[PDB]
Design a protein around this ligand. Structure first.
Ligand code: GTP
Ligand code: GTP
Ligand code: GDP
Ligand code: MG
Ligand code: MG
Lengths: 74, 430, 78, 79, 48, 52, 442, 442
């Protein structure tokens, strides 16, 4: 029902955890490089093990502290 | 773990300009040379290809060699040309004339000392040196002659490192140069003795990729050099970004080469599809594997159905499951079992890297060691014998000083390489 | 005997700390000291068309199948 | 607020796309001037050169304690 | 036992929420592709 | 080295030399000894039984 | 009381990340090494001591080393979230890998790195007062894991002597494979694992993938799921040292009860309540149900079928709310089955352990929360089929000397392949002979 | 009670500057020589007396001379921060250096300056009531340090007689090098240090560089770091004279316990908690850990490995909060080790000292602040290997008479090269013979 809402009256309300920029606490900001405007930068640039280290102690990924795009996480 | 790049001849310098544009973009270096990236993951491995100059700047560890500066004069005035170190441009005063003997013996020996001095100056600065990387065509004159001369000198000076070459090879249908068989045969003789691993690409396959797969209305050499830069930057991706299953040039060589002479490989890159079709098919690991073995995405004229795979390697970039990769590689080996050499229990190695190329969710590059490459060497040997029996253009090479005995040695070595491939193709368990 | 647990004299190799055990060995498998380095050799004089490269006369390296490490005074693990 | 604003969607600009095969709008073979330069000879003769500017940042560290500040400050016979 | 039952209940609810979020995420990946496709088509038309 | 206990105005908290130790550990040990001597003279068996 | 963990290469370090996240969350140590200053439970218990030591500043730090020849994975640990937990000396990294060559790891590259490893192990063993063994995690399919793991186990075996060495090993899956040269590395590895290990647990990734697809509802699993399952198994085996219980089991009792002859030390491992949160509400999970679960071959973490062999000994570890009478009733029910067979020389086939601390639940985990769990390690003759497929693949590849020039160039005599292949052949014949009925008295 | 320090040449003066910086900051004497009224030291206290004397107005002045042939370094001291601390007579400077010639320093130039040095040293020794030795800092690689140090030690040994002379010497590093003629100066030097020193401590700059790169986290060390480490070591050794403790150790006890035969006086030195502030807070630092540290060859301040020889005597100095049970347990653990060996004629191998004053920390990033430290001086036959590399370099140079005309021109017979090389050869043979097991009873 989320994938194909169609014309149904009983639509599923959004969860509020997914955002295009990847952060639920910070608004969109213009990137330093012009060609990176359309990319989802906070999601592309993160290793898998770092992701499971940061997100491991939370039942849900939006409760985790923001990535921060820093070599040691903020 | 630093790589040193060498670009030789017109083809090498032109492919190099696009390669360094792609690499500068991936590490977020502005065309002025200033770091402007947006994640520390870009900065933490910049040393692999760049040296650091003062106040933010990065300079690329590459040596450019050519006998006439015309291509180098164009790239310098090009949009990214400023990044290159001025002292790294080496040039002579007369052309190679598309002649291997001239490029190897007369202007080669004249300029080679300055190239070796620059390569040694660059090598001794690294804390740990990985292999050298050279891009050149085998059919040309300065590319073939000076590339193989420099390869021989570096193999004498650094025998414990890796030696890697990317090479352009003559199309089976139309020649770009009349004397291609001599230059190709002598260059393959030099590589088969000196090289550790060599990748071959046909320009006819890149033209067919552009016209048939991407449906480009007005393709240009910038597109062909972008396809080459894409595969070249993909093979090294696990060296310079994190991942779930790291890989390295030496591990690729150890898994791909069964016997030391069998080090010539086929190349392919999977996610190629026209902008009209792209809305009809989502990216997924089954889709990448199907495209990866799809002949539309393969960069050689020879077809696997006439040979057998000894070994293959697939490098995946992106956030993806290892289970789907393993079962896809098993399913392809099980369904097409006749095309895989049976006395090796598993021919495919897989590797997974977290960071995809910009603008793509996922990508894979494929390297294949297949016996159908024997047909190319056989065709080149036939054309060489036709020209040599009649002394078709031999006076140029003999006038430079070459002994005719060199030609018979190179022909004999290529014929033995073809025989060795044919013998391993028809081996059996008994 | 060479000094033990040193941080000098093995630049360019794969070693991090050289000779912790204090035995009679080289700091690393790759040559720490070589005939020529950044000075280079003469290559113009050494290339002639009358002494060309012969069949099966390429340089012998570890990838070809020649144990280069046995020719140096580096102790292998028994 | 999290999506890309419409100022970057409702324009026609070729710099927003990363380089790739098929992105050949801004390259050679389409320029109006196709003359070949003699930059190298002029550079080696020493009458033209490139030298881009650099970047330097002069921010002071924050959160330093009293002892650190004192350390930074550290570095006539009349009765 | 009662405390264990409450903990199990809240865990199940949070897993259901996460399962919703992944399906919410895939469409934003699709949008990221769509923007580039549109701009490329417009530039090609201008060149023609 | 700072002192174990706070509210100590003496900057050299630990400077135990011969003179410092005699002039500081004389009075405190003597006070403890005289407190032990006089405080243990009035023994109370009933109070000890109550504490037990 | 204390145990020291040694992590080697990529699989061993990645499994180490899951193990230490779990051990921290189970004891309550924060990722920065400091316990919550406001959490006054009332009695500061000593249970952490098995895995942590205090730095005198009151921080806890773990008894582990991370070993790798490539920098990337250890630098990823150095820059992650747990940067302050580990002592920087414990994270040891070289410059370049062993390139899938056992010969390169054993002779050429591991010989340079091994002395730093021995100095760290020396510094750990000096900070103990009842060390009772080493736990080792590595894969034998890769070059540095095989070569440096063997060299380090040999050096530990000469220096420490009688001290126990227990290995968790990732073996080559029977048809899923990742590299071409896996048979050579596994054959050369098995001689060292035979001589220099007291108990060896065998794992195959294909079994844990099947378990995660069948029991959990995950369509696209990745290594983090497998590593979390391995961490749960290690926590179950070491729980007997750390929490109160009715019947404790020290690691020497494990070694005494599980190993009948000194060469017969390869064991299978399985875990019972692998279940999702949605499945957990449709079924009760009593002691007898999970005891019945550990004996089904669908529960195993190694691709072997134990119905094709005979059990010699089983060790069952129960943790959580279990009462000994229920364990006895369950074991009595298992003994009646006809598809479970014990060698006739092993009449008392079971060892039991009972601990009161239930298994911990990890916030991002995929396992449900459960009141009780059981973990089993068992020794069985079925392992002989596992060795046979490597021997057949080695014979197929070695008949044409397919890759030997790499090994000979990196320092190995060609003769070493034949010696190792004959030693594994003798081990296979030992497993055939031990399972032969005593028809000598007829 | 009192000790006088003599600093010669460039290394010796710069190390003296670092030492007196440390001794001032530990006692609390202001760089003007006064003492602030807000401190709780007390006017009556005497601990300074080992190193300072008061003129009666309460200014402090130190018991040291600085000797150099070039002006620049002493003029740097004269114009620096401690200008008002030193008496101007104490800073003695010639006009021009000994130009890396031992012969020029000993015969030509030092002979003019030496009588001034003796008159100032006499003026110091007359203002004492319990002088108990000379501490000398010099390098044997340079010309004035070798030549004037030898000449001055000879004159001191005639004039003062029985008073003890303990040397700290910067010897030529085994592969780091600064000048070509280092072997000649070091060989000619060792004869004088052999005859005219009671205990000689050996230092190598390459070892202190290794210690500051490996243990400390310093990417770009400079001589001030090394000199601060040396100052810490000397402060540790002299702390036993200056503060209260459980087991005191007088300077005569070092010589009595450490020296078995009158020629066997060359000792190895090490210091335990050389550690950075970030590492120090990652690790506990008990007595037994730092005692284990002083025996690792990675801890040594001389480039030698003691595993290639046998110990004859060890003297362990503990300062700070230490309890005798930890010293006894540590020494018993060291005795247990199998890679630590003592000659069979030295059964009671250890001397202990225990002092309550913890080591002082000097502002900067070269040592953590710590409550306790241990310092070791030890006599071992391994030192013979240190001399052998200098002899090989001497033989290489002397085979071609590479530089001898300079030495012969400045006043030395060619015979002196052969004499010195044979005397150091005899010192190696002494260390070979002393280390030979007593197999005479068979
Ligand atoms: N379960 C599990 N298996 C892994 C993991 N990482 C690698 N493997 C498996 O182990 C084998 C590869 O061994 P590696 O650890 O990559 O080898 P290595 O220790 O890195 O040795 P080198 O390649 O020489 O550096 C393959 O079968 C992989 O599937 C992991 O994190 N978890
Ligand atoms: N640790 C340390 N070593 C030093 C220092 N200064 C010089 N050295 C070393 O000592 C040797 C040089 O000896 P010098 O002290 O310069 O010789 P010199 O006493 O000045 O003799 P002249 O040159 O004739 O004046 C070299 O090995 C230097 O590395 C120092 O301040 N600290
Ligand atoms: N793909 C590709 N092939 C090229 C390029 N430039 C030249 N070639 C090919 O390389 C061969 C000519 O070799 P060339 O570089 O001119 O040799 P040189 O004269 O020694 O530099 C022909 O087959 C050309 O088609 C290029 O930019 N891209
Ligand atoms: Mg690896
Ligand atoms: Mg001087």
């Amino acid at each position: 029902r989320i994938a194909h809402p169609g014309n149904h009256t009983d639509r599923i309300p959004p969860t509020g955890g997914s955002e295009y920029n990847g952060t639920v606490t910070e608004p969109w900001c213009a990137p330093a490089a012009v060609d990176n405007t359309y990319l989802r930068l906070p999601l592309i640039y993160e290793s898998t093990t770092h992701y499971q280290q940061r997100t491991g102690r939370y039942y849900t990924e939006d409760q985790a502290p923001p990535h921060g795009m820093s070599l040691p996480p903020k | 773990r630093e790589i040193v790049c060498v670009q030789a001849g017109q083809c090498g310098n032109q492919i190099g300009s696009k390669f360094w544009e792609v690499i500068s973009d991936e590490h977020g270096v502005d065309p002025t040379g200033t770091y402007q990236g947006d994640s520390d993951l870009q900065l933490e491995r910049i040393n692999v290809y760049f040296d650091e100059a003062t106040g933010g700047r990065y300079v690329p560890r590459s040596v450019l060699i050519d006998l006439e500066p015309g291509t180098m004069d164009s790239v310098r005035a090009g949009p990214y040309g400023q990044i290159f170190r001025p002292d790294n441009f080496i040039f002579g005063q007369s052309g190679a004339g598309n002649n291997w003997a001239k490029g190897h013996y007369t202007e080669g020996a004249e300029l080679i000392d300055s190239v070796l001095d620059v390569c040694c100056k660059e090598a001794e600065s690294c804390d740990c040196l990985q292999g050298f990387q050279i891009c050149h065509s085998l059919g040309g004159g300065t590319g073939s002659g000076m590339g193989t001369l420099l390869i021989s000198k570096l193999r004498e000076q650094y025998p414990d490192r890796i030696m890697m070459t990317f090479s352009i090879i003559p199309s089976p249908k139309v020649s770009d140069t009349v004397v291609e068989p001599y230059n190709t045969t002598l260059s393959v003789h030099q590589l088969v003795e000196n090289s550790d691993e060599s990748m071959c690409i046909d320009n006819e396959a890149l033209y067919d990729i552009c016209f048939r797969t991407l449906k480009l209305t007005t393709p240009t050499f910038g597109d062909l050099n972008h396809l080459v830069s894409a595969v070249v930057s993909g093979v090294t991706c696990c060296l310079r970004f994190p991942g779930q299953l790291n890989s390295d040039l030496r591990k690729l060589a150890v898994n791909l080469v069964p016997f030391p002479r069998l080090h010539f490989f086929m190349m392919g890159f999977a996610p190629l599809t026209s902008r009209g079709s792209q809305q009809y098919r989502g990216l997924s690991v089954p889709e990448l594997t199907q495209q990866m073995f799809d002949a539309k995405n393969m960069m050689q004229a020879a077809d696997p159905r006439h040979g057998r795979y000894l070994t293959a390697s697939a490098l995946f970039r992106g956030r993806m499951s290892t289970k789907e990769v393993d079962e896809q590689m098993l399913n392809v080996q099980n369904k097409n079992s006749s095309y895989f050499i049976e006395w090796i229990p598993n021919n495919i190695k897989s590797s997974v890297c977290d960071i995809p190329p910009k603008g793509l969710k996922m990508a894979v590059t494929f390297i294949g060691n297949n016996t159908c490459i024997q047909e190319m060497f056989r065709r080149v040997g036939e054309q060489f014998t036709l020209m040599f029996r009649r002394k078709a253009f031999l006076h140029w090479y003999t006038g430079e000083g070459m002994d005719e005995m060199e030609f018979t040695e190179a022909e004999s070595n290529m014929n033995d390489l073809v025989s060795e491939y044919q013998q391993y193709q028809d081996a059996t368990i008994e | 005997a060479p000094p033990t647990a040193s941080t000098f004299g093995f630049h360019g190799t794969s070693a991090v700390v050289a000779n912790v055990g204090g035995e009679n060995t080289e700091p690393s498998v790759h040559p720490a000291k070589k005939p020529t380095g950044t000075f280079g050799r003469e290559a113009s004089s050494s290339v002639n068309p009358s002494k060309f490269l012969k069949k099966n006369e390429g340089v012998g390296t570890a990838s070809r199948g020649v144990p280069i490490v046995d020719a140096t005074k580096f102790v292998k693990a028994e | 607020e999290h999506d890309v604003p419409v100022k970057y969607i409702r324009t026609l600009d070729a710099r927003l796309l990363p380089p790739r095969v098929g992105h050949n709008w801004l390259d050679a073979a389409f320029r109006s001037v196709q003359g070949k330069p003699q930059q190298l000879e002029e550079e080696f003769r020493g009458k033209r050169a490139f030298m881009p500017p650099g970047v330097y940042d002069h921010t002071p560290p924050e959160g330093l304690g009293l002892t650190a500040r004192q350390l930074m400050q550290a570095l006539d016979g009349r009765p | 036992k009662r405390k264990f039952l409450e903990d199990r209940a809240r865990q199940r609810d949070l897993l259901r929420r996460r399962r919703f979020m992944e399906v919410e995420e895939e469409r934003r990946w699709a949008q990221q592709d769509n923007l580039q496709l549109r701009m490329a088509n417009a530039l090609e038309r201008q060149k023609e | 080295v700072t002192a174990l206990d706070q509210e100590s105005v003496g900057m050299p908290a630990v400077y135990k030399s011969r003179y410092n130790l005699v002039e500081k550990e004389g009075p405190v040990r003597r006070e403890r000894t005289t407190l032990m001597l006089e405080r243990g003279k009035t023994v109370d068996k009933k109070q000890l039984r109550d504490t037990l | 009381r204390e145990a020291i963990c040694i992590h080697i290469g990529q699989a061993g370090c990645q499994v180490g990340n899951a193990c230490w996240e779990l051990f921290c969350l189970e004891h309550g140590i924060q990722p920065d090494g400091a316990m919550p200053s406001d959490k006054t439970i009332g009695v500061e218990d000593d249970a952490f001591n098995t895995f942590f030591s205090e730095t005198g500043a009151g921080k806890h730090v773990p008894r582990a080393v991370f070993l790798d020849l490539e920098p990337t994975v250890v630098d990823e640990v150095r820059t992650g979230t747990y940067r302050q937990l580990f002592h920087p000396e414990q994270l040891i990294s070289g410059k370049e890998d062993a390139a899938n060559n056992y010969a390169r790891g054993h002779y050429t590259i591991g010989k340079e790195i091994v002395d730093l490893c021995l100095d760290r192990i020396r510094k750990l063993a000096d900070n103990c007062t009842g060390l009772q063994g080493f736990l080792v995690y590595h894969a034998v399919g890769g070059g540095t894991g095989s070569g440096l793991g063997a060299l380090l186990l040999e050096r530990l075996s000469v220096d420490y002597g009688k001290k126990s060495k227990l290995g968790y090993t990732v073996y080559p899956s029977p048809q899923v494979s990742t590299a071409v040269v896996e048979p050579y590395n596994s054959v050369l590895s098995t001689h060292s694992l035979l001589e220099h290990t007291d108990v060896a647990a065998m794992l195959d990734n294909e079994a844990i993938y099947d378990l995660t697809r069948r029991n959990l509802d995950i369509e696209r699993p990745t290594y983090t799921n497998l590593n979390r399952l391995i961490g749960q198994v290690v926590s179950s085996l070491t729980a007997s040292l750390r929490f109160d219980g009715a019947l404790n089991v020290d690691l020497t009792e494990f070694q005494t009860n599980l190993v009948p002859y000194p060469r017969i030390h390869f064991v299978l491992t399985s875990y019972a309540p692998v279940i999702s949160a949605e499945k957990a509400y449709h079924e009760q999970l009593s002691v007898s149900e999970i005891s019945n679960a550990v004996f089904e071959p669908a529960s195993m973490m190694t691709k072997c079928d134990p119905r094709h062999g005979k059990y010699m000994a089983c060790c069952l570890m129960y943790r959580g709310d279990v009462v000994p009478k229920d364990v006895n009733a369950a074991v009595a029910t298992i003994k009646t089955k006809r598809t479970i067979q014990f060698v006739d020389w092993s009449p008392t086939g079971f060892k039991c352990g009972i601990n009161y601390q239930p298994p911990t639940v990890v916030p991002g985990g995929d396992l449900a929360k459960v009141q009780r769990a059981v973990c089993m390690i068992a020794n069985s003759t079925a392992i002989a089929e596992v060795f046979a497929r490597i021997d057949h693949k080695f014979d197929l590849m070695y008949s044409k000397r397919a890759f030997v020039h790499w090994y000979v160039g990196e320092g190995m005599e060609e003769g070493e392949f034949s010696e190792a292949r004959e030693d594994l052949a003798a081990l296979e014949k030992d497993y055939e002979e031990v399972g032969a009925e005593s028809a000598d008295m007829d």
